[PDB]
Amino acid sequence: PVTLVEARYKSFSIKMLKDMKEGVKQYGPNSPYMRTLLDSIAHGHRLIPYDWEILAKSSLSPSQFLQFKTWWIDGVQEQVRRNRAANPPVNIDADQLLGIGQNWSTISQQALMQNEAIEQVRAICLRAWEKIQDPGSACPSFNTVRQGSKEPYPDFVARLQDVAQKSIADEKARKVIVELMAYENANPECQSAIKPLKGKVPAGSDVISEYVKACDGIGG
Amino acid sequence: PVTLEPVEARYKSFSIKMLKDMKEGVKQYGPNSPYMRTLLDSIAHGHRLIPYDWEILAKSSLSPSQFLQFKTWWIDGVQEQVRRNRAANPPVNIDADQLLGIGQNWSTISQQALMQNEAIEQVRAICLRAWEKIQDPGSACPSFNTVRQGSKEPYPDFVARLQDVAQKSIADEKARKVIVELMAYENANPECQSAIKPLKGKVPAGSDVISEYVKACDGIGG
Amino acid sequence: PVTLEEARYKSFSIKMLKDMKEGVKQYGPNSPYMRTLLDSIAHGHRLIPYDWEILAKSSLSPSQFLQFKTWWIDGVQEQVRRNRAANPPVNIDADQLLGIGQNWSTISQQALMQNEAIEQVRAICLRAWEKIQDPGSACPSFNTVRQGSKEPYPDFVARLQDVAQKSIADEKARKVIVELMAYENANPECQSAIKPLKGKVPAGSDVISEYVKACDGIGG
Amino acid sequence: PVTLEEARYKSFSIKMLKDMKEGVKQYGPNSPYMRTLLDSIAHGHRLIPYDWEILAKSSLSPSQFLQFKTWWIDGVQEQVRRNRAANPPVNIDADQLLGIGQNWSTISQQALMQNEAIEQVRAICLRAWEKIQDPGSACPSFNTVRQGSKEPYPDFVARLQDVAQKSIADEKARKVIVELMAYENANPECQSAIKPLKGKVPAGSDVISEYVKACDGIGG
């Protein structure tokens, strides 16, 4: 990252890259430990689009760098359409956020970027990292995730909370969908255990807290 | 590595932690994972490597079955490079046994610590192209006829295999592009073959063809 | 053609049209004999787009004048995207090449085209003629053409250079594919016979000329 | 060809090319009719190696121009090993015969070759034309061609002189093999009919003319 009297760009150490690879390989790219570590890296530095490529290339499988680059390209193609419709329109084109082109293809040209382009490339890079799949799997639809027999209830809810995180982009639309689907796809035991509790949050609680509290020793 | 303080050049062996990190990286992730490539480039470009140190680094990091392949492709690379040092004007004075580190003039560390940079860069390029050909610890290099996206397999896991095969076999990158962009459609399953076919041969703006190809048949897991 | 001794449109002779239909019907529209015959008419005359209408209609099957008109129309849609996007932009629109419209729909209007336009229509009709299929077949894919057992080797490579000419437009990209696929799709018997000769062209030779040398007696 | 009335390169006529393709397609590239027709063009003109490019491309199958270019290239690699190893050495390198390179890659450079070079290219293209296969077959071995039962005898010997012309280059070595194999690979019925006539040619005759005399009525 770059350090603010002029712009000086220094690569990462070996320890940071070793920790990132050892995290991604063992726990997954979207385990909560990796999200916490990645947000601590990104919010605590000044990342140019060179550094997202250096970080993601040296940490991900080659089957996952393709997905990272693809959803980065999709995110900047949608962010450009909201950038020209401004009043005044901002001078943030596609080739300034992708880190390629004629005027933006070397680290000396990129190190003189403003705060708004930094905070705009950060959100689309994080949303790109949020969509990277696990090595052997594909993202399923909501018709497939059902609590099978002999399976705990929070293990069932924590699959829905991830499926609704890869697909749907708005959090308010995530909450209503997972609150609805937590009752329809449940086992008959947890459905009968959860039916007298529906639509009743007592005080300062989440709905799914009382839901997982309700059916508790049911499966096993 | 070796270092130069000027009128003389001194030698020092590798660290005790560096070889440990290299062995853990090669054993757990692979010899040609993208992490080990940047680690090896950071070691090579930031130091001065004589072929003695290349043999020490490759001996203490690879399998007993992988040092054979590294030595074989090192020998083949020097055999192909010598034929471009005698067909030059002026003829470049780098024979076979200056690159391989053998012989009578080039068999000790004090004999090898006096090399010039036009041979250091050559042995660096040959050693890196040799390391790019070492296989995984149980497999042989397949041909392009066999890499096919089977049913119930995601799409980018197939393009990753195609790019690995094209990196191991073909030595020209401009030819590496135009073969994998064609084979990425002829070897897909019928569902991605139906999904790519509307968008075939059209780039919108400033992207790679695979970036729209993986975007097209995204959720093929039903 | 049109002759300038200042314009004079002369029709085709009865003997020239008799030899084109007799040649197309017996050898094919893309035999090497018809390729040199068609160039001696094109490069030796002044063909307006009204004359490619008469020459192709009176020489091709009714199922092949449909394919010749398709890839003619599709070829102008890419020529205008290299006509206006150049500096300076040239006045070559769509309906000047296709020979339709209001200003380009008679002999007396098309008889005064310039040599920038005559040379551009002549290079896209000849690219349309390279895609006209045989009278009963469709263009196969690259992974389908394999050397069958008890089939001679130069008959296999002759098929390989035909699939790689209807599909790929760049002649450099043909060169890297038809040499690569010549060993991989081959027979098991030649694959043990080409492999010692692989990738070592000695002096003043082609790659495949050294390959057909090695399977000189592979028929049983 | 080139005419000297001091150089003038004239292209081929439209009627000469029409008869070569009509002849090759119907009878074969190595019928006795095409052998005398090709010699009347070669021995009656001045063919530069640019003209063997046009004549063979506009007359052969695409699978047969690959074989014509292979044995042309292979034939120059043996001519240079009889060019420099003679006393005195002649200035006939590889890229003068093949018509490639920098000094031999246009019409105006090749129009001034000498009659030592014109006569040497003319004897190796004509040897390349003797090896071009039929449009669906490969060259069989000598122990495969046997006279089948209920097959006429001169049709068997006509096959024997065709295998012994693509394989063996020395015309004296053809003579001792096609006469020896004419009795050994023959039918049981002619083998009892040729054996009293064996090895006794009376006066002013060929060996096989006395052999086809003896199987005049062997068809059943």
Residue numbers in the entry:
A (entry chain H): 1 to 4, 21 to 236
B (entry chain G): 1 to 6, 21 to 236
C (entry chain I), D (entry chain I): 1 to 5, 22 to 236
Paper text:
Our studies of HML2 CArec show that an ERV retains the ability to form capsid assemblies using the same architecture as exogenous viruses. Analysis of the shell structures reveals the intra- and inter-molecular interactions that drives CA assembly into pentamers and hexamers and their association into shells that encapsidate the retroviral genome.
The D5 particle is an elongated or capsular expansion of the T = 1 particle with polar regions identical to T = 1, but containing five equatorially inserted distorted hexamers, consistent with local two-fold (dihedral) symmetry. Moreover, adaptation of hexamers to the local environment is also a feature of our other D5 and D6 capsular assemblies, where hexamers interact with each other in the equatorial belt. In the D5 and D6 particles, further configurations are possible depending on whether pentamers and hexamers are located at poles or are equatorial and interact either longitudinally or laterally. Nevertheless, all hexamer–pentamer interfaces still fall into group 2 and all hexamer–hexamer interfaces still fall into group 3, albeit in D6, the α8 displacement for the equatorial hexamer–hexamer interactions are larger than in D5, due to the lower curvature of the equatorial region. Exceptions were the N-terminal β-hairpin that contains a large loop insertion and is more mobile than in the crystal structure, and the NTD–CTD linker region of D5 and D6 equatorial hexamers that displayed weaker density.
